[model samples]
Target chain A: SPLLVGREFVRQYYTLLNQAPDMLHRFYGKNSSYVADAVYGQKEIHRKVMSQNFTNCHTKIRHVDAHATLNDGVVVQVMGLLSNNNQALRRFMQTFVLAPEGSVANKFYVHNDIFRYQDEV
Target chain B: SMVMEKPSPLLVGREFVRQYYTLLNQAPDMLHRFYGKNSSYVHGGLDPADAVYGQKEIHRKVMSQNFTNCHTKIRHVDAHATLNDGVVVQVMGLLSNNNQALRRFMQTFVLAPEFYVHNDIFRYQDEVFG
Candidate 1:
């Protein structure tokens, strides 16, 4: 007869949720790491990148500070560093924390909607 | 017989307008067929099956030829059209991508690209698409 560890499963789930708050508790953990097998994502994104058509106006962030201009352009900025470059095996949660605000800056926002479809050239 | 009354055919503003359109309709046509020289169907001296296969062959040729270059910006501006009949269609002025206006325009429905843009993620996908 095999004995089941009653409390062990709950404890592991708790630690994973605590250390990575967004990846765990946020969004009912439906977007949690434990649910990764159901949903898969490509390599980790270490930096941000965006582009606008020639006539469109745009801007970007650098080191958490805003740098923008009223011209067709692209912007790239760092988010955070990762110790494991093995981006193949790891996936991260990227939910919108702050929606783009402010008219003077023309702040752009990205949600899950942007990456919903496979892009073609 | 001593008193005489005359009624004259005087032209009014409406009459003048009718006359104006009448003259306009009488003028020669101002438009020309832009693709005048491209009349005949050209098959590359090969089987009709070859024509369908040629499309893929040309695509492969372009890919292989382009691969030799280290970096490239594929710009597709319209060139002058030369028909099989030797008629040439001149190239009109080109409108380049408006970088400034692009700064303002974005995919707004998703609350995306209202202002600050992502650069790196874009390039990653750009190459993936390219």
Candidate 2:
């Protein structure tokens, strides 16, 4: 998946999540919709993510799929596991819509995000 | 009292959702009607690469499956309206393998301006995880 820009973006994404999860909200913007109680994400995204104490977590993605959309955007589906120092592994699924990040090629921002937990198996 | 919300987007999305699953359960071939030219379907089986591109392949795959005995129970569904009248839909649910092995799955779809499935990706969020 060399040309897999979505795979590439997702890889970069969790890196930020692991290294600097507080900054993960910047990947979203005012127009973005995150399926929380609030839709226009950004600040709400910040609240929910930063509220977590597991910044030291490591994210392992088992699968991510991407397909192109209109206006140079792409939609992606991701499923994976999250681990913290506590060593509890949690399965998670998230879907994203990446819009072009201005004039830069292959650069995009999270235009939409839906995060959910699969619970203990 | 507050103004009533203009519910067009939400209504359309939820309705669009029901019709799709209806076909998936019994009339699997008819599910192809929801896909268009640029559409792609990824069935995340053993490998992530298990997928098909374009309408013909998706149609062929569904026809081959012939999911008459299969049943899908939608646990939940959500939609986000994007620009140019597009909608990003995510569905989480379970499907019966007949043995009632009970596989839980997630399917996300990007609906194009034509209101057809532009990109469909399916993944099983089974009990086992690495």
Candidate 3:
């Protein structure tokens, strides 16, 4: 049940990201941190929020693997396909760390998010 | 009555990664002992649609190749998180090919419940951004 709940959260999260990027604010914790390869911190996240690259892009998580850590949190690795306007772009890898269930509105509050993109080579 | 506690998944995942690089560069033949028939290997650096399934294919892709005289050093283990029935680890490492070629790699391994280095799902992408 924990695994399914985690998977569902990702499914909904991506949907919101593509359909309504503004709704993602609720999913992140106040002290949450984020990094994308060379980019890092909340400032970058805000930059993405305001950038055209973020608005036009959509992600599809193809493979998800979740594990419960000793600290009661879950670490999830999501292998995703990123696209823009129905054209395939690159392979996306994301790692998420979340607060345990019931810790934040029965939904995992993403404490940390790491993103990476591998272009077709 | 006393019960033997299993090692933490973090430690298990870390150990599996450590041994993986060691055998990958030093003794590849011995690496086969860790992989099972259900393993699958995917190269994210290549086309996203490409994936090599089955244990033997995985072996041929990594182990059977010529990586002799090379040394792989783990740069950092960014995360070692627990999975429902396995552990998913994100690792960044450097592969020094016979002291000439240096390749940086970011690899994610999904170690199954059996706690072996053999992964049910293994995905890798190189750090080629220049």
Note the Cα lDDT for every prediction shown.
0.19, 0.76, 0.59
Clashes of 2: 0
Supply the TM-score for candidate 2: 0.86
How close is each model in CA RMSD to the real structure? Answer: 27.4, 3.6, 8.9
User: After best superposition, candidate 1 residue B123: deviation in angstroms?
Assistant: 11
The segments of candidate 2 whose C-alpha lies over 4 angstroms from its true place after superposition are A1-3, A39-41, A84-87, B1-11, B97-100, B126-130
Give lDDT tens digits, candidate 1, residues A1-121.
0001112222332344334423322222111111111221211211111111111212111111011111321111111112122222211111121222235363332111111111111
Clashes of each: 26, 0, 3
TM-score against native, each model? 0.16, 0.86, 0.52
| lDDT, residue B16, model 2 | 82
- Model 3 lDDT on a 0 to 1 scale: 0.59
Highest DockQ against the true fold, candidate: 2
Model 3: how far residue A107 lies from native, Å: 16
Q: Candidate 3, fnat value?
A: 0.00
Give the 10-residue window scoring lowest on summed lDDT in candidate 2 chain A. Answer: A32-41
Poorest lDDT segment (10 consecutive residues) of candidate 1 chain B? B103-112
Instruction: Give model 3's docking category.
Output: incorrect
Q: Which of the two, 2 or 3, has more lDDT?
A: 2
Per-residue lDDT tens digits for candidate 3, residues A1-121, read: 4457568878987887788765565666445555523233345555555463455667756666554542455556676677765676677667776665454465667666666665422
- Candidate 2 residue lDDT tens string, A56-101: 7888887777878766788888888878766877887788888888
Top-down lDDT ranking: 2, 3, 1
